[PDB]
Design a protein that fits this description.
The protein is α+β, with helices and mostly antiparallel strands. The protein has 16 helices and 26 strands. It is globular and about 80 Å long.
Length: 568
C-alpha cells in the first residue's frame, strides 16, 4: 500500500526514513557544474532534442523509484496506492501537500490531463501502454482510479505510477509537439532559472519545494543550483573538466581512460578518478546474423562463425585490455545463465521446448570461445561440416557456392571490429566484405533488414519486461523498423517471454529470465561483443557522495548527481 515492487515485495519498510543510497546528512548549498556532449533545443522531454536534467528535478511522477532494487516504487505525489494482487485495478491516493512550483495544488485533474495528453502525444510504447487502460477516473479530487480489467499486463500499474504529472493550468497542449524553450512548470525540487539554447540550462532550487521532507526525497537535491553546459564533442568537454570548469564526468574512451588522466589537478588531489560497480546487468552488443536470409538460417553455422571472433586480440590492440567479453544477455548479474546449471524449476519451464537449449548452455558450461588457432578453426569446421558446409579448395562451400557475406557498419570503430572478424573468418575460407555506409543508408537498411550482418544493441536491464517482445518476439521478426534485428521467430523464445512477464515472485522471475537467457544464447542470433565491468568516473574533490551507492541502474548516478553534495 506504500510500496510497489514489480516482482515480490518492496524491500523498504512502510516507515523507512530515506532511501539507503541517500545521505540525510548531505549538506545544502553551492552550484554543481555538469557537462554534457552534444546540444539541445527543447525543454520538453516527453514529446516525440530535449535538455537533460528535467525529469526528477522538475517533472515528477506519482511514485519515486528506488535504484537500490530492480524495480520498486515508493510514494511521491501519490502518498499511497490501492492495488490488487492480480493487478486488474490501481487507485492512487494523492498527497494533499503536493503543489507545482507556482504554489498551485496538484489534483486528480492534473493526473488525468497528463494521462490523456501523453496517451495521445507521448512516446510510442507509452501511447500503447496507456492505451491498454480501460478507464481513468477521479472519484474525488485526491484519487485517480485506473481500470485495467482484461489487460493481463503486470507491468502496467508501475508504468502508470512513473508517468510525469503535468500542470493542466499551465501547459499549452497545442504547443506540446513543438520544440519549446519556455521555462516549463513542474513540481520538483528545482525550477528552470535560465536557458540558452544549445549552450546551458540553469536549475535553481525551489525554496518551497513541496516534497523536501518526503521519505523518498530526503538526502537528495543538495546543490542550490545545477548548471548543465553542453559541449561540441568529447575533447572540449574533457578540457573543461581538466580546467576545473566541470565538476564530474563519465569516461567512455579507453584511450583517454588509459593515458589521459595524468594532469596536475589529478595528482595534487583537486580531482579524483574512480571505477565503480553495482549489480546492474551488463551487455549485450554483438554481431547480429540476419537469420531471414538463407546463408544464416542454420544455428550450427551461426555458432561456428561465432567461434572465429578473437576478442582477446581486439581487446589488447584497440582497447588497452580494459574490456571484458559479454557472455550473457544479462551478464554479471543474478539474472545471468552464465556458469550456472539450470535449476529444476528452470527445466520445468523449458519442458515444452525440448529443442530450445543446447546441452552446453543448459548445464552452465558454455562461454563465447576464448582464443589464444587450428583447434578453434577445427571446431568451427567440424560444426560447419555437420551443417553441410565443407571447404573445397581455399573456400567454404554452401549449396555448391563459395560462402561470402557483408558486414554493414556505421563508423570507424565498428569497421575495425568487423575487419578483424573478417580476417579471422578468411582462415576458414569465408569471404567477408566490410562496408561502411553513411547515416541515411545505414538507418534505412537497418529498418528494412537489408543486411547480412550488422552490429546491434540489446541493452540489459535489471527488470526485463515488455521491451523483450520488441527485440525478440516472432511477431516483430518481420516488422519494419523493429528492434528484432536477427529475425528471431521461436515459439520457445515467445514462451519464455510470456513466462518472465507473468512471474509474480522475485525467485520465479529470476528463474524465468535465466531460462530465457539460455534460449536466446542457444539460438546464436548474435556474436556477443564486450563491455566495461565498471563505470569509469572522475570528479572534483569538492563534491562528495554517500558511502553507499545504489545497487542497480546504469549509469550509477543521474546526470545531475541528485545524491551528491558540496563538501564543507
Amino acid at each position: 500500500s506504500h510500496g510497489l515492487a514489480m516482482h515480490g515485495a518492496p524491500q523498504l519498510p512502510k516507515d523507512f526514513d530515506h532511501f539507503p543510497y541517500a545521505d540525510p546528512a548531505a549538506k545544502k548549498g553551492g552550484r554543481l557544474r555538469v557537462g554534457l556532449p552534444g546540444t539541445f533545443d527543447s525543454l520538453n522531454p516527453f514529446n516525440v532534442t530535449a535538455a537533460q536534467g528535467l525529469v526528477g528535478n522538475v517533472f515528477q511522477g506519482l511514485m519515486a523509484r528506488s535504484q537500490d532494487e530492480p524495480f520498486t516504487l515508493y510514494p511521491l505525489i501519490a502518498q499511497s496506492i490501492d492495488i490488487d494482487p492480480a493487478r486488474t485495478r490501481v487507485t492512487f491516493h494523492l498527497d494533499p501537500r503536493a503543489h507545482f512550483s507556482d504554489g498551485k495544488p496538484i489534483t486528480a485533474e492534473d493526473v488525468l490531463f497528463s494521462f490523456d495528453l501523453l496517451k495521445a502525444k507521448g512516446r510510442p510504447q507509452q501511447r500503447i501502454a496507456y492505451g491498454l487502460v480501460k478507464s481513468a477516473t477521479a472519484p474525488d479530487p485526491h484519487r485517480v482510479a485506473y481500470d485495467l480489467t482484461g489487460v493481463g499486463d503486470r507491468e502496467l500499474p508501475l508504468i502508470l505510477a512513473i508517468m510525469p504529472v503535468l500542470p493542466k493550468h499551465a501547459l499549452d497542449v497545442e504547443r506540446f509537439s513543438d520544440a519549446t524553450l519556455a521555462k516549463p512548470l513542474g513540481s520538483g525540487p528545482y525550477v528552470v532559472a535560465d536557458v540558452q539554447a544549445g549552450a546551458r540550462l540553469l536549475l535553481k532550487r525551489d525554496p518551497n519545494y513541496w516534497g523536501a521532507d518526503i521519505p523518498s526525497q530526503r538526502g537528495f537535491y543538495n546543490f542550490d543550483e545545477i548548471d548543465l553546459q553542453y559541449f561540441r564533442d568529447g575533447n572540449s568537454l574533457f578540457e573543461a573538466f581538466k580546467a576545473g570548469l566541470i565538476d564530474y564526468r563519465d569516461e567512455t574512451s579507453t584511450t583517454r581512460w588509459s593515458t589521459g588522466y595524468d594532469f596536475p589537478a589529478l595528482r595534487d588531489g583537486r580531482m579524483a578518478r574512480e571505477s565503480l560497480k553495482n549489480e546492474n546487468p551488463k551487455g549485450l552488443n554483438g554481431f547480429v546474423f540476419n537469420t531471414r536470409r538463407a546463408l544464416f538460417k542454420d544455428a550450427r553455422l551461426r555458432e561456428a562463425f561465432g567461434m572465429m571472433f578473437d576478442f582477446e586480440w581486439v581487446n589488447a590492440n584497440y582497447y588497452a585490455g580494459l574490456y571484458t567479453r559479454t557472455k550473457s544477455f544479462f551478464d554479471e548479474s543474478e539474472l545471468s545463465s552464465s556458469g550456472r546449471g539450470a535449476s529444476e524449476k528452470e527445466r520445468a519451464l523449458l519442458a515444452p521446448w525440448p529443442d530450445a537449449v543446447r546441452a552446453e548452455i543448459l548445464e552452465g558450461e558454455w562461454r563465447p570461445p576464448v582464443s589464444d588457432d587450428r583447434d578453434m578453426a577445427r571446431r568451427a569446421l567440424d560444426l560447419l561440416a555437420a551443417a553441410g558446409c565443407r571447404v573445397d579448395g581455399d573456400r567454404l562451400m554452401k549449396d555448391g557456392e563459395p560462402f561470402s557475406f557483408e558486414i554493414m557498419v556505421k563508423d570507424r570503430d565498428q569497421e575495425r571490429l568487423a575487419l578483424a572478424y573478417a580476417s579471422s573468418l578468411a582462415r576458414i575460407g569465408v569471404e567477408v566484405r566490410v562496408r561502411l555506409v553513411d547515416e541515411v543508408q545505414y538507418q534505412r537498411r537497418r529498418q528494412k533488414f537489408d543486411f547480412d550482418m550488422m552490429i546491434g544493441q540489446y541493452v540489459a536491464s535489471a527488470s526485463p519486461g515488455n521491451e523483450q517482445r520488441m527485440r525478440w518476439s516472432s511477431a516483430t521478426a518481420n516488422q519494419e523498423s523493429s528492434f528484432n534485428l536477427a529475425g528471431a521467430a521461436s515459439p520457445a523464445i515467445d514462451g519464455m517471454i510470456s513466462a518472465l512477464l507473468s512471474a509474480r515472485s522475485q525467485e520465479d522471475f529470476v528463474t524465468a529470465v535465466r531460462a530465457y537467457d539460455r534460449v536466446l544464447l542457444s539460438g546464436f542470433y548474435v556474436v556477443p561483443l564486450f563491455h566495461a565491468s565498471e563505470q569509469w568516473i572522475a570528479h572534483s574533490t569538492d563534491i562528495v557522495r554517500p558511502e553507499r551507492s545504489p545497487r542497480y541502474g546504469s549509469p550509477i548516478f543521474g546526470p545531475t548527481l541528485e545524491s551528491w553534495w558540496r563538501k564543507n
